[PDB]
Structure formats: C-alpha cells, structure tokens
Amino acid sequence: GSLTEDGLSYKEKFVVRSYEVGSNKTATVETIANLLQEVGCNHAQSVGFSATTTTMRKLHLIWVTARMHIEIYKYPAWGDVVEIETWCQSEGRIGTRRDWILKDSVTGEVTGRATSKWVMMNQDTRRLQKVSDDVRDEYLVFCPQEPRLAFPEENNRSLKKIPKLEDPAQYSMIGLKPRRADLDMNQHVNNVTYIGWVLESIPQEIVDTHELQVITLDYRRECQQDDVVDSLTTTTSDSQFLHLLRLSGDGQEINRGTTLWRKK
Amino acid sequence: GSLTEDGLSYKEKFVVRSYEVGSNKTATVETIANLLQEVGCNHAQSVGFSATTTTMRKLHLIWVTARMHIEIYKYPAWGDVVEIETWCQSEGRIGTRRDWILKDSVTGEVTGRATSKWVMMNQDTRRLQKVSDDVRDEYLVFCPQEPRLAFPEENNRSLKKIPKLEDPAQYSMIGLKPRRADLDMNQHVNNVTYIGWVLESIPQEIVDTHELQVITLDYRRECQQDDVVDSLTTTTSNDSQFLHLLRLSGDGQEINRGTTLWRKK
Numbered sequence A: 001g002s003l004t005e006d007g008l009s010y011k012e013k014f015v016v017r018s019y020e021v022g023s024n025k026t027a028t029v030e031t032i033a034n035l036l037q038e039v040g041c042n043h044a045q046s047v048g049f050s051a052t053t054t055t056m057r058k059l060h061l062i063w064v065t066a067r068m069h070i071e072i073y074k075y076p077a078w079g080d081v082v083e084i085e086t087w088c089q090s091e092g093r094i095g096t097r098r099d100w101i102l103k104d105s106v107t108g109e110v111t112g113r114a115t116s117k118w119v120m121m122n123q124d125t126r127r128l129q130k131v132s133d134d135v136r137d138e139y140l141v142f143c144p145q146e147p148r149l150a151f152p153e154e155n156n157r158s159l160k161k162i163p164k165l166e167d168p169a170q171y172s173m174i175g176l177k178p179r180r181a182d183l184d185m186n187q188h189v190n191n192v193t194y195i196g197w198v199l200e201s202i203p204q205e206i207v208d209t210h211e212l213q214v215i216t217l218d219y220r221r222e223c224q225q226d227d228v229v230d231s232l233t234t235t236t237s238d239s240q241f242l243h244l245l246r247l248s249g250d251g252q253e254i255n256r257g258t259t260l261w262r263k264k
Numbered sequence B: 001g002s003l004t005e006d007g008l009s010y011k012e013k014f015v016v017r018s019y020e021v022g023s024n025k026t027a028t029v030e031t032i033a034n035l036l037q038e039v040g041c042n043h044a045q046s047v048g049f050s051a052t053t054t055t056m057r058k059l060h061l062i063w064v065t066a067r068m069h070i071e072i073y074k075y076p077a078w079g080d081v082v083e084i085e086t087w088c089q090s091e092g093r094i095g096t097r098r099d100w101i102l103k104d105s106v107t108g109e110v111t112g113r114a115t116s117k118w119v120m121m122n123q124d125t126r127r128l129q130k131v132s133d134d135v136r137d138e139y140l141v142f143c144p145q146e147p148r149l150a151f152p153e154e155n156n157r158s159l160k161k162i163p164k165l166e167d168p169a170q171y172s173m174i175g176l177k178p179r180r181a182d183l184d185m186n187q188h189v190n191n192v193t194y195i196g197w198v199l200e201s202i203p204q205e206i207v208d209t210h211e212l213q214v215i216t217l218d219y220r221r222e223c224q225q226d227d228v229v230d231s232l233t234t235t236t237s238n239d240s241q242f243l244h245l246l247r248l249s250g251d252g253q254e255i256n257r258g259t260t261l262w263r264k265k
C-alpha cells in the first residue's frame, strides 16, 4: 500500500483468500469490512500515527465509530485483486469521517463504497465530546481541504435516521457471544463482529436468493467480552430489513441498523 | 505465491494485518491456521486442481482433516512478512499428509512448523475409506518421492495418542455456536473455528502470562451449522499442558479432542 501523490489519500491492493468467501465464492461483507479497517490502519501508520494524535494521548482521548455505511455493487471473487482507496475528513467539532472506494483492479471499475462517522471519547470515562481546536489543527494537514465524499448525493442512504425495532421481531438469533478471535489487539470486540451478529437474524432463504447491497449500522454501546447479545430483524419492505442488537438480559441497545438486498 | 523450482512444494508471503493480531500485537494461532489453509489451497490450484482428482470427483470422494499439529517458536508481529512453504506426501493407503514451514522473511529463520493428516471420505455417506491405487497414482506426480517431514524426530509430539478427557473438567466454555463467518465456501464449519473453540476454555490468566507453543487437534465428527458445542479443558502438568475435549451440548457426542503446551512469557 501507499499514500497517493498528494499525500491526502491511501491505496492498497488485496488478493481475496479462500477462507474469506461465502457460498457464492465471493467475499463476505465481513471480509470487505475487515479490509476497510486494514486500509484505514495502514493509512494512519503511513501519515505518522504510532489514529490518536499527541494532544489526544495527553488527554486520554480516542476515536470511536458511531456509524458505518457500506454499499457493494459487485463482491470480488476468490483470487481476485480488489484495490481500496481511503481518506479522512474533518466534520468541524462533531467528529471525523473516513471514506472508502473499492475497485476491481483489472477493470478499474468501482465495485463498492463506504463511509463512517467517528466521535471523540475519553477512553477511561467513556464520555463523548466535541473535537477541540488543538485536536483538529494537528490532523487537518492529513485531510483534503475541499470536500471529497464517497456518497455525494444530498439526502442519501448514509445519512438516514434509523428507527428502533419494536417487539415482537419477525426474526431473531439469541445468545450470541464473542470468542477471542472476535477481539482486537486492545481486547475490545472488533466493530466487524457486530455486522456479523446483525446478519445472523436474516433468514437463510434471503441469503440464498439475494445479494446484500447496502448496510447502515449505528454503534450505541459496546459488547463486553462477558456480555451476551440478541439479534432482532423485521422486514420493512428488493427486500429491506430493520435490525436491533441488544443485551440478552436487560435488553440494553448496543446497535441499530438497516439492510437492503437485491434478488440474484 | 509460486511453486518452487522442482514443482514439488509451494511458497507464499503474507503481511500480518491489524485485525489478525492479539493483545501482544502478534498473529493469533487462528490467523496462523487460516494462512496454512490459504497456502494449501494456493498450492492445489497451482498444480491443476479446482484438492479432488478426476477419479475422486467421479466417485464423490473428498479429503477431510483427521489431525492438525502446529508448533510456533515466534508469532509474527503486525506488519511483519511471514513466508510459508508447503508440500504434500502420500502415506500409502492410509491417506495423505500436508506439511508447512513458517519463516521470518527478513531473517530467514524458522519461526513455526505444522503437519496435518487427511483421510478419504465419501461426500454423501460420510464413510471413511482407504486410498485406492488409481487415486494414489493421480496425485503422486505432485509430491516428493523421498520423505520430507516438517517433524522428522523419532518420538515427536505430532504422532502422540490423545486420551479422552474424563468428567468433571477443570474448566469449561458452554453453548458455543458457529455464525456465517465461521463457515467455508461449501457451507461447512471451517476447521480453524474448532481451534478457537478449544482455546475458549483456557483461563484468561494463562493466555495473559503464557504463549501457546504446541497444539495437537484430532477431528472426529463435524459441527453442523445448527449444533451447539461445549469446550472442556483440564491441566495435565515452567510449562503448562492441558487436555481438551469439544462435544455436542446436548447428547455429549465427541467432535474433537486435543492437547496444548504453553510456555511462560
């Protein structure tokens, strides 16, 4: 991988692995989400991060994902090379945004796109906060100054408000628990695990006859390594679904989202 | 990746990813096991497969893993390049064996080794069988004729008989279920998922103060996508050794048995 000529974006090529594909012999949406995370990490390392800046480490502040939105036109097949371009942008004091463009390396055609919203949080108290003047000036030198959006369209799917699924759910998958492979290097549940858990309550008949086109996921609270999650889904319609992940006991919300599926 | 000069082994380099590492910023044993599976698949494709031979496809026969044995001296760190060499060998009519050597690409030093035993099974009936001459002759042109062993030694750990854990287990992790990410392209539970499930019953204190050195896992029966598994562990021992058992949550039917050896950090 490498930064582009202007040093304001990053590109990396990936060869899709045998264990990374589903029954259609193409990359799962979890594989795509892990590759997005990987190219984002390689971008941060390339621009000097040990994505916490000097003032952030001093104040015990970190970036946390508030929303992930992914749209796939074509899933890359096993053995195919996919090229991903990523960049970050300042969203004033609200937070930051990371965008991605996925392309088929052979044809150069856009096969997917993603966007994510990140907020600032104190790592010890878990208290969200606005982005200060000091932390913003030290990361603006790594972002394009003019807007560069993966989802330019005014009022597009990436910015839609998501409602809360009301009981009873049409479908459910109960008692989901993370294992050590689901954790990251900081012993926290990887954000991609939550996408998998959301997808667990979609019926197998939908998965067998449809391809996932769009997924929007809001992150409200973390699952601890000793928590148990229930995944709920209701059809709201192409086929569209509303999703809810909540703790198995008290029913505390951890995520809400929507998926759009196209008939094969 | 590419076949070596003689066309009897295959090599591939991998850059360790951010999501592939644990708390020590080095590759988990599940990442290593997935890379072993990936280099094995790339080797089969490079020698003409799509690893079923023409006679196997005609008789609805497939290779299935009976045992996996992995020894790691050094886990590669995040961003490091690891090079893996793999090859297959005929074990007469019993089955086949796939071996691997892992090396640090920068130093050229051996950081790990693995070996696996595969048996022939009818895809539809699940009945194990010996390897016929017609099948053996079709794959021998892709294997070294003289023995090449990742674990040459006389009394080596890869061939040790594993006992059955007796109740009560010292530790346990109950109600483990596979999700769609745990399945392969054929909708079967990936063999690496079983390694993760075995490791779930090891106490977090062992994981925090020790590094996994050796793991031997026997595969007896597969977990269906609607089955539920219990993972059991008992200490059998500077070094810590454990005996493992994975069984179905209901009837207690065995699916795997294994052993792990851990050295203090």
Ligand SMILES: COc1ccccc1-c1nnc(N)o1
Pocket (backbone or CB within 6 Å): A062, A064, A065, A122, A123, A124, A186, A188, A221, A222
């Ligand atoms: C690596 O992430 C963390 C580290 C420390 C404290 C919290 C987190 C976190 N991740 N997601 C949320 N909501 O908090």
Ligand SMILES: COc1ccccc1-c1nnc(N)o1
Pocket (backbone or CB within 6 Å): B062, B064, B065, B123, B124, B186, B188, B221, B222
């Ligand atoms: C892809 O694997 C299969 C396909 C068809 C039938 C059985 C298997 C299998 N894999 N492991 C065992 N024990 O059976």
